[PDB]
Design an enzyme around this catalytic site. Structure first.
Site, mmCIF file in Angstrom:
data_model
loop_
_atom_site.group_PDB
_atom_site.id
_atom_site.type_symbol
_atom_site.label_atom_id
_atom_site.label_comp_id
_atom_site.label_asym_id
_atom_site.label_seq_id
_atom_site.Cartn_x
_atom_site.Cartn_y
_atom_site.Cartn_z
ATOM 1 N N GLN A 161 -4.655 0.745 -10.778
ATOM 2 C CA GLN A 161 -4.230 0.351 -9.424
ATOM 3 C C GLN A 161 -2.921 -0.433 -9.407
ATOM 4 O OE1 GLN A 161 -6.419 -3.693 -8.607
ATOM 5 N NE2 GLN A 161 -7.869 -1.976 -8.538
ATOM 6 N N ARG A 220 -0.037 -5.792 -0.157
ATOM 7 C CA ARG A 220 -0.535 -6.340 1.132
ATOM 8 C C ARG A 220 0.128 -5.587 2.295
ATOM 9 N NH1 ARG A 220 0.351 -10.325 -2.552
ATOM 10 N NH2 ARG A 220 -1.193 -11.979 -2.837
ATOM 11 N N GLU A 227 -3.906 0.295 -3.945
ATOM 12 C CA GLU A 227 -4.836 -0.619 -3.263
ATOM 13 C C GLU A 227 -4.068 -1.394 -2.182
ATOM 14 O OE1 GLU A 227 -6.720 -3.519 -5.748
ATOM 15 O OE2 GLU A 227 -7.345 -4.727 -4.052
ATOM 16 N N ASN A 233 -5.450 -8.483 5.222
ATOM 17 C CA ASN A 233 -5.931 -9.807 5.688
ATOM 18 C C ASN A 233 -6.119 -9.728 7.205
ATOM 19 O OD1 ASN A 233 -5.993 -11.342 3.231
ATOM 20 N ND2 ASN A 233 -3.749 -11.295 3.241
ATOM 21 N N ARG A 235 13.136 -11.871 -6.004
ATOM 22 C CA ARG A 235 12.794 -10.508 -6.484
ATOM 23 C C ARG A 235 11.680 -10.579 -7.533
ATOM 24 N NH1 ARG A 235 18.183 -7.170 -5.637
ATOM 25 N NH2 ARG A 235 19.087 -8.779 -4.273
ATOM 26 N N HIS A 294 9.227 -1.338 -6.579
ATOM 27 C CA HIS A 294 8.854 -0.072 -5.904
ATOM 28 C C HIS A 294 7.631 0.575 -6.570
ATOM 29 C CE1 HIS A 294 12.188 1.051 -8.781
ATOM 30 N NE2 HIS A 294 11.362 2.070 -9.075
ATOM 31 N N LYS A 327 25.382 6.779 -6.252
ATOM 32 C CA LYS A 327 25.826 7.329 -7.561
ATOM 33 C C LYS A 327 24.905 8.456 -8.025
ATOM 34 C CE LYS A 327 27.655 5.628 -11.896
ATOM 35 N NZ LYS A 327 27.150 4.750 -12.977
ATOM 36 N N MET A 328 23.608 8.184 -8.047
ATOM 37 C CA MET A 328 22.607 9.058 -8.700
ATOM 38 C C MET A 328 22.016 10.016 -7.674
ATOM 39 S SD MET A 328 20.931 6.491 -11.370
ATOM 40 C CE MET A 328 21.833 4.976 -11.046
ATOM 41 N N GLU A 353 10.219 5.204 -4.429
ATOM 42 C CA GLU A 353 11.115 6.149 -5.124
ATOM 43 C C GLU A 353 10.555 7.557 -4.941
ATOM 44 O OE1 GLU A 353 12.464 4.950 -8.981
ATOM 45 O OE2 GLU A 353 12.591 7.000 -9.656
HETATM 46 C C1 LIG Z 1 17.905 1.428 -4.633
HETATM 47 O O1 LIG Z 1 18.882 2.265 -5.260
HETATM 48 C C2 LIG Z 1 18.599 2.766 -6.506
HETATM 49 C C3 LIG Z 1 19.311 3.868 -6.957
HETATM 50 C C4 LIG Z 1 19.048 4.404 -8.197
HETATM 51 C C5 LIG Z 1 18.048 3.874 -9.023
HETATM 52 C C6 LIG Z 1 17.778 4.468 -10.346
HETATM 53 C C7 LIG Z 1 16.606 4.754 -10.943
HETATM 54 C C8 LIG Z 1 15.314 4.248 -10.324
HETATM 55 C C9 LIG Z 1 14.880 2.933 -10.943
HETATM 56 O O2 LIG Z 1 15.744 2.203 -11.443
HETATM 57 O O3 LIG Z 1 13.684 2.677 -10.944
HETATM 58 C C10 LIG Z 1 16.490 5.524 -12.151
HETATM 59 N N1 LIG Z 1 15.374 5.655 -12.829
HETATM 60 C C11 LIG Z 1 15.513 6.566 -13.861
HETATM 61 C C12 LIG Z 1 14.502 6.967 -14.733
HETATM 62 C C13 LIG Z 1 14.809 7.873 -15.725
HETATM 63 C C14 LIG Z 1 16.089 8.401 -15.861
HETATM 64 C C15 LIG Z 1 17.107 8.012 -15.019
HETATM 65 C C16 LIG Z 1 16.803 7.103 -14.006
HETATM 66 S S1 LIG Z 1 17.851 6.420 -12.808
HETATM 67 C C17 LIG Z 1 17.358 2.747 -8.554
HETATM 68 C C18 LIG Z 1 17.615 2.202 -7.313
HETATM 69 C C1 LIG Z 2 -7.336 -14.023 -7.648
HETATM 70 O O1 LIG Z 2 -8.758 -13.993 -7.494
HETATM 71 C C2 LIG Z 2 -9.339 -12.830 -7.046
HETATM 72 C C3 LIG Z 2 -10.708 -12.681 -7.223
HETATM 73 C C4 LIG Z 2 -11.339 -11.534 -6.779
HETATM 74 C C5 LIG Z 2 -10.643 -10.504 -6.147
HETATM 75 C C6 LIG Z 2 -11.358 -9.299 -5.697
HETATM 76 C C7 LIG Z 2 -11.049 -8.010 -5.920
HETATM 77 C C8 LIG Z 2 -9.682 -7.670 -6.487
HETATM 78 C C9 LIG Z 2 -8.695 -7.289 -5.403
HETATM 79 O O2 LIG Z 2 -8.717 -7.913 -4.315
HETATM 80 O O3 LIG Z 2 -7.907 -6.389 -5.652
HETATM 81 C C10 LIG Z 2 -11.886 -6.889 -5.647
HETATM 82 N N1 LIG Z 2 -11.504 -5.637 -5.686
HETATM 83 C C11 LIG Z 2 -12.561 -4.791 -5.392
HETATM 84 C C12 LIG Z 2 -12.506 -3.400 -5.365
HETATM 85 C C13 LIG Z 2 -13.647 -2.697 -5.035
HETATM 86 C C14 LIG Z 2 -14.844 -3.345 -4.744
HETATM 87 C C15 LIG Z 2 -14.925 -4.716 -4.778
HETATM 88 C C16 LIG Z 2 -13.775 -5.426 -5.104
HETATM 89 S S1 LIG Z 2 -13.564 -7.131 -5.225
HETATM 90 C C17 LIG Z 2 -9.269 -10.680 -5.972
HETATM 91 C C18 LIG Z 2 -8.616 -11.813 -6.421
HETATM 92 ZN ZN LIG Z 3 11.762 3.704 -10.471
HETATM 93 ZN ZN LIG Z 4 -7.209 -5.129 -7.267
#
Ligand SMILES: COc1ccc(/C=C(\CC(=O)O)c2nc3ccccc3s2)cc1
Ligand SMILES: COc1ccc(/C=C(\CC(=O)O)c2nc3ccccc3s2)cc1
Ligand SMILES: [Zn+2]
Ligand SMILES: [Zn+2]
EC number: 4.4.1.5
Lengths: 183, 183
Positions: A33, A37, A99, A103, A122, A126, A156-157, A172
């Protein structure tokens, strides 16, 4: 022991000397997962199911703490078990689920919004969807009113896009067969 | 419509009326990646490979823009093609990959840290790893010096853990067969 000039990135060799083989104790671990939010699950469900083609595979409600969890995945809705316990166990053992945490009440609150992690401060950037054709996918996204961070041929890409979901999270849009031509 | 009492979230029926069936145009879409920014790839690679048993399936360096991308996944290292173009195409078509972004120089900056999304401003919360046994996995994490957000038997929902990676991102540790017992 000596101070070094600015390295730059890690070399392939440096990166690999930081990597250990999978311990047998981790052999059945899977990346299950990613949790985001969402202000309004009505909008998020419509986006992830209708726009992106995901299936809602499990919904969990917590009446006392007042939040819901929605699990979205690329699964055949006919594979969803009908019995409650078997359903949850199948949903939460699917790879690559999204997931969405709702809230209760955030959908009624004009001021509230979540932070997408792509401005200060940051962290998360994504999720990414692999598609057979970025241009046809993006043409359809345009027609369905989807907001773009990056159109496939802008910047660019080329042949790589970013869209945003109703909360403003970046998604993405990538063709695995075209990424070598950017690397 | 009349003004309503405070949100109780969606009913199962309401949530379903917000879902569309998967359009044929999306039929080959898959949830490929989650991207996190990492201060220090040496520390992040060691954690994700040694502690969590993921495999580094692809490294991309951008000498001019000055950043690296690391793709981690639960894949058998023997399945990684050896030739560069086939490797990238296989890596970036794997489901459930983790993309770590290293902005060169952040490892040399005392003050810099990324934001995990679990304090203001919130958005992204966690990734989650499904494991066959939360207690044995967590015992090993304890022995390996892993920092915990939530030990499996601390808090209301027992049998569920959160650890943090070297940047402080939360990672849920869950047994899919035990999640029904928390609803
Ligand atoms: C928000 O603008 C951009 C533009 C390009 C990118 C380039 C990416 C995505 C990323 O950085 O997650 C690329 N990912 C890969 C993965 C494999 C090969 C080449 C690239 S460029 C990211 C953000
Ligand atoms: C930081 O403390 C916690 C404790 C429990 C949880 C409960 C979760 C995890 C989540 O919110 O992602 C649960 N996830 C599931 C999924 C399916 C069924 C029951 C639950 S409880 C979250 C944060
Ligand atoms: Zn990426
Ligand atoms: Zn979870």
């Amino acid at each position: 022991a000596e101070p070094q000039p600015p390295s730059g990135g890690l070399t392939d060799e440096a990166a690999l000397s930081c990597c250990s083989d999978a311990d047998p104790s981790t052999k059945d671990f899977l990346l299950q997962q990613t949790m985001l939010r969402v202000k309004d699950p009505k909008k998020s469900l419509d986006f992830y199911t209708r726009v992106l083609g995901m299936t809602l595979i499990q919904k969990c409600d917590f009446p006392i703490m007042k939040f819901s969890l929605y699990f979205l995945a690329y699964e055949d809705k006919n594979d969803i078990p009908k019995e409650k316990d078997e359903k949850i166990a199948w949903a939460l053992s699917r790879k690559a689920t999204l997931e969405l945490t709702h809230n209760w009440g955030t959908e009624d609150d004009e001021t509230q919004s979540y932070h997408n992690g792509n401005s200060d401060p940051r962290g998360f950037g994504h999720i990414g969807i692999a598609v057979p054709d970025v241009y046809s996918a993006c043409k359809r996204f345009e027609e369905l009113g989807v907001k773009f961070v990056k159109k496939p041929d802008d910047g660019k890409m080329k042949g790589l896009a970013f869209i945003q979901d109703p909360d403003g999270y970046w998604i993405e849009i990538l063709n695995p067969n075209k990424m070598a031509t950017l690397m």
